[PDB]
Amino acid sequence: WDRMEAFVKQWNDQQFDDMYQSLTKDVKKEISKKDFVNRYKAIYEQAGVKNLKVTAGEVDKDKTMKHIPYKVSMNTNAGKVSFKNTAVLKLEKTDDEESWNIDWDPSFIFKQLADDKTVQIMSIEPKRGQIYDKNGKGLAVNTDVPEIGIVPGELGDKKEKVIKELAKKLDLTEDDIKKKLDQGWVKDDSFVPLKKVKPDQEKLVSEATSLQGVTRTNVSSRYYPYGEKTAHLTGYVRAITAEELKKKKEGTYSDTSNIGIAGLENVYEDKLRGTTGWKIYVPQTGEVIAEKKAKDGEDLHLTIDIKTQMKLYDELKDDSGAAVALQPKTGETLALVSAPSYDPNGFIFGWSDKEWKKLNKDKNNPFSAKFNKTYAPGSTIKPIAAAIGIKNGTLKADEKKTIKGKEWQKDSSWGGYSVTRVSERLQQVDLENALITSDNIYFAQNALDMGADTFTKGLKTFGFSEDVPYEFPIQKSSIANDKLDSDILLADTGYGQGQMQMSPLHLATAYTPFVDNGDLVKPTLIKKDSQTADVWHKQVVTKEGAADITKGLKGVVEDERGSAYQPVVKGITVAGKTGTAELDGTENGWFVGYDYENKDLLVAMMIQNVQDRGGSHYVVEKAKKQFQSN
Numbered sequence: 001w002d003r004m005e006a007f008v009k010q011w012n013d014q015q016f017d018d019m020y021q022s023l024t025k026d027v028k029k030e031i032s033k034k035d036f037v038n039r040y041k042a043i044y045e046q047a048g049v050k051n052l053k054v055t056a057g058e059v060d061k062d063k064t065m066k067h068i069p070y071k072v073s074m075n076t077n078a079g080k081v082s083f084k085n086t087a088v089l090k091l092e093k094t095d096d097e098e099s100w101n102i103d104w105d106p107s108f109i110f111k112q113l114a115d116d117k118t119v120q121i122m123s124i125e126p127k128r129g130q131i132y133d134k135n136g137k138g139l140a141v142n143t144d145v146p147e148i149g150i151v152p153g154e155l156g157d158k159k160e161k162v163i164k165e166l167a168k169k170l171d172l173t174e175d176d177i178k179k180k181l182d183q184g185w186v187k188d189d190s191f192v193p194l195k196k197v198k199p200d201q202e203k204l205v206s207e208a209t210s211l212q213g214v215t216r217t218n219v220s221s222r223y224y225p226y227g228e229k230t231a232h233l234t235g236y237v238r239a240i241t242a243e244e245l246k247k248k249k250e251g252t253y254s255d256t257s258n259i260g261i262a263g264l265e266n267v268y269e270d271k272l273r274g275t276t277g278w279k280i281y282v283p284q285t286g287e288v289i290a291e292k293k294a295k296d297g298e299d300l301h302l303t304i305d306i307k308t309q310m311k312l313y314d315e316l317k318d319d320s321g322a323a324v325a326l327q328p329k330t331g332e333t334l335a336l337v338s339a340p341s342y343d344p345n346g347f348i349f350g351w352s353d354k355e356w357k358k359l360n361k362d363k364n365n366p367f368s369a370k371f372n373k374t375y376a377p378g379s380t381i382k383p384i385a386a387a388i389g390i391k392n393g394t395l396k397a398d399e400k401k402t403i404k405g406k407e408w409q410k411d412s413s414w415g416g417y418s419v420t421r422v423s424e425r426l427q428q429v430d431l432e433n434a435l436i437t438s439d440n441i442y443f444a445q446n447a448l449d450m451g452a453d454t455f456t457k458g459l460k461t462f463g464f465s466e467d468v469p470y471e472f473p474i475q476k477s478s479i480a481n482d483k484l485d486s487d488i489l490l491a492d493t494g495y496g497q498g499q500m501q502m503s504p505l506h507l508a509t510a511y512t513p514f515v516d517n518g519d520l521v522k523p524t525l526i527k528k529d530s531q532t533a534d535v536w537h538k539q540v541v542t543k544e545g546a547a548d549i550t551k552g553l554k555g556v557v558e559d560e561r562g563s564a565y566q567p568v569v570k571g572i573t574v575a576g577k578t579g580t581a582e583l584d585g586t587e588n589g590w591f592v593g594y595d596y597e598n599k600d601l602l603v604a605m606m607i608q609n610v611q612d613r614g615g616s617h618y619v620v621e622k623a624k625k626q627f628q629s630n
Contacts, residue, residue, distance in 0.1 A: 003100040004056055004068055004089060011054050016040040024090055024101045031104075043109055046121045047280055048077035048250030056087075064091040066100070072108075077121070077251040078278035078290035083111035110282075110289055117284045123254035124277030128222065129297035131234060131264060131272075133304040134332075134527050138225050140234045140265060144218040145349075146197045146205045152181060153188035154213035162212050169208050170195050196221060198349050222258065222348050226306065228341035229313045232369035233304065233472075235263015236344035252276060261347075262367070264300065264525075267472060272297045301527040303332035308626070312337040312603075315622040321588075321607035322370035324508040325626065328594055328602040330533040331512070331521040335603075336472070336505070340366040364608070372474045374501035375606060378579035379563075380590045381496040382443050383549045384510055385450075386431060388458030390545040394450045397548035400428035401442055408441045410448060410487055419444040419491055435552030435577070436559045440495040447494025452484040455494075461540045462510045462520060469536055470505065471525045477502045496579065508604035511592050513541045514549050514575075515599050550575050550596050557593070557624075564591065564620045571629030573597035578616035587611040589619040595627055603627075 003022060010018040019040075020033045043049070057069035066089040073082035088103035106113035113119060131140035148170065155162055167174045177194060186192055196219060197205060209216045224234055237258040245253055253259060254276060260266040277294030281287060312323040316339040325335035342359050351359075359366050389395030404427055409418040421441045426433055434442035447455055459479050460466065468474035480499040484490045492498035502510070505523065512521040518541045522534035541549070553575035556562040563578040576593025589610035594602040603626050610618045 001059075001066075001068075001089070001100060004087070004102070007102055008054050008056050008070070012052060014044065014052060022102050024103045025092055025094065027104050036104075040109065043119060047119075048278075049074050050250060051075040065089070076278070076280055076290055077123070077276075078280045078292045081110070081280075081290050085111060110280075112282050112285070112287055112289060117282050119289065120281055120283050122279050122281075123256070124279070124294040125254070125257060126274035126276060126294040127220075127296040128237070128258065129268075129272040129274070129299045131300045131302065133302050133306045133309075135305070137306050139230055139302070139304070139306070140222065140224055142220055143199065143223045145199050145221040145223065146202065147193055147217050147219040148195050148197060148205060148208050149191050149193045149215060149217065150177070150181060150213050151189065151191055151215055152186065152213070154215070156212060158212045162214065165211055166194070166208060166214055169204070191215065191217060193217075193219070196349060198345065199223075224344045224348075226310075227343040227345055229310055230304075230306075231263075231341045231344050232338040232371070233263055233302075233309075233336050234344060235265040235267070236261055236347045237265050238347040251278065263344075263369075264302075264472070268300055272300065274298070302525055303327075303334065303527050304336070304525070305334045308335040309337065311335075311626055312605075313339075315625065316605075316607070317341075319607050320364040320370075320609060321605070321619075322373075322504040323603060323605045324371055324504045325601065325603045326508050326512070326521075326523060327600055328512040328515045328521060329600055330531070331523050332527075333523055333525045334601070336369075336371050336525075338368075338370040340364050342366045370606070371504045372472060374475050374477055374503045374506075375588060376581035376583075377500060377502045377507060378496040378581040378588075378590060379438055380502075380507060380577050380579035380592050381493070381500060382435060382438070383514060383553060383577055384459070384462055385443055385446055385455070385494055386435075386549055386552075387462075387513060387541040387545055388455060389446045389450050390548065391458060391461075391541055392450065392454045394454070395431070395446055397431035397545070397551075400430045401434075401445065403427060403429050403439065403441050408444070410491070414488060417488060419495070431548060432552040432555055435549075436555040436562050438556075438563055438578075440497070443495035444491035445494075447490050448487060450494075452490050455490065456484055458540075461537050462513075463506060463536060464502075468503070468506060468509075470523050472505075474503050474505050477506045496581075504604050504606050507590070507592055508602055509536070511577075511594060511602060511604070514546050514553065515594050515596070515602065516543075516546065518543050518546050553577055553593075554596055563616060564593075564624075566617060567621055567624070569624045569629065572624055572627045574624060574627050576623070578620060580610070580615045582611075585611075587615060589616040591616060591619040591623040593623055593627070598628055601627060 007022045016037045020036045052074045054072050059066050067086050069086045071084045089100045091100050133139055163174050163177050180192055205216055222237055237260045240253055240257050240259040260269040274297035275295035278292045280289040308325050312335045316323055316337055319339055323337040406421050406424050407418040419441045421439050423437050429439055429442050464477045464479050478501045489498055493500055509523050518539050519535045520537040520540045522536040557564045557574050574593045575596040579590035581588045586609050588608050590606050592604045605619050605623045607619045
């Protein structure tokens with residue numbers, strides 16, 4: 001019949017407002033359309049009802065009352081659910097027109113339901129996988145932390161004064177505690193959790209539990225054992241919002257779930273979470289409509305060495321910038337540091353108000369990692385360019401160039417603009433002395449002699465303009481705002497005063513061909529039991545070209561004329577390059593270096609607001625400390 005088919009179509013399509021219209025006059029009373037629609041929406045939403053199939057059968061007796069059997073199957077967060085039932089169709093006249101109407105009752109939601117029975121949907125959170133460094137040191141783990149609560153029966157006739165004192169002691173409100181004590185499940189002998197506390201605060205727990213009826217347990221909790229020292233690398237988890245929950249695939253989260261918002265917590269959310277358990281049941285009888293068991297998440301093992309991480313943190317902790325430390329042979333990531341930072345434990349245990357407001361008004365954006373953003377690299381481009389110039393035959397490292405004065409233009413067509421070098425001591429300038437004196441004209445002429453096409457292709461072999469193959473998302477490096485579309489922009493990009501932007505991670509990666517082999521190494525955060533150093537582009541420079549570049553980068557640190565000579569550090573065997581990118585404004589300082597003798601460490605460091613602190617020098621002093629002085 002038409003009415004039944006239309007009702008079934010509306011219900012398969014889950015349009016409950018259209019469904020309410022077909023109900024009998026009796027059911028219209030005692031159940032308002034508001035309550036009908038709200039009850040369906042709430043139950044189906046919270047249970048995760050999807051894949052709904054309602055199919056109708058055949059009538060039996062032939063009249064003003066019919067019976068039509070039907071069946072319902074569906075998928076819920078707790079599994080497949082299906083039942084059979086019989087709809088009563090009564091013919092009824094309202095106003096002046098008859099119609100067949102369905103005599104609805106709560107058993108059309110789930111079969112167990114009736115006018116004295118409801119449904120409840122509880123969830124079981126799995127154990128989240130943990131994050132370890134290369135030596136098994138826990139970076140994002142699960143630990144048992146104190147949990148202060150109230151047993152109501154133990155309060156006696158002191159409930160009010162106890163709530164007042166405990167609210168003052170735990171920085172909660174009296175209303176919040178009372179709301180928790182008034183929950184439906186709360187019985188006089190049950191422990192009512194009130195607040196989770198960090199492990200280092202047993203004195204607070206001792207003070208608080210010494211009140212009437214206030215007691216203590218331990219609850220499992222995420223914990224970030226090194227806090228802001230690894231905050232950008234771990235990221236964090238925190239409670240999911242109702243709006244976030246509405247966007248996810250039903251079943252994967254509940255209203256009380258943690259979700260990874262930033263860092264590796266977010267990047268590996270699926271691996272770390274696991275499977276959420278569910279139970280749909282009827283509270284008046286205890287009957288279970290459906291049930292699904294949880295499943296723990298998987299652990300994550302990183303290449304990070306927390307010792308290197310902490311050395312870099314100690315150097316950057318009061319500044320604004322980033323530092324990457326790679327093992328340039330294997331491509332493993334020893335350290336990823338960004339400053340300023342934050343304690344991700346704040347998102348688990350709660351923030352103090354002053355700290356939250358501090359972090360949100362900080363103009364250097366503590367919650368944002370800087371090692372995956374792209375900044376102007378400045379002079380640090382020069383060796384890379386040199387590599388390309390040696391790779392594509394247009395540059396010989398041992399041949400000197402004629403440069404007279406401190407200014408140079410290609411021809412009259414530049415006019416008022418010329419490339420400026422800081423010194424004019426050397427008139428015959430080879431590659432080594434070009435790097436040591438950071439000669440801008442040398443490298444402008446390198447770019448020009450090279451041409452735009454070869455230089456673009458070369459920059460692409462060092463990983464510009466492509467997705468960065470790395471497990472932590474890295475914004476792509478840019479050669480120019482559009483393209484190298486003029487001799488002037490080409491020359492400026494040659495010596496690092498153009499439109500280019502690199503990430504610290506990428507700059508670290510792009511000095512790896514200089515260390516030994518010439519290969520651009522594929523960086524990785526994930527610890528692998530395989531001792532296989534993956535290559536990202538093969539032989540982007542030759543071995544002998546890498547040696548030629550290493551000579552000049554060595555000189556930058558060891559020759560008195562170099563930009564990285566001060567401070568003189570006995571013991572280190574470090575070759576590298578400095579940079580300063582300007583922004584009455586500020587300027588950012590760069591140092592990229594590697595151990596040209598031990599070949600097992602490379603660091604890139606970038607610090608902001610260094611114009612009044614000696615520029616790149618301020619960075620250099622902090623960078624040399626990171627290297628083996630043995």
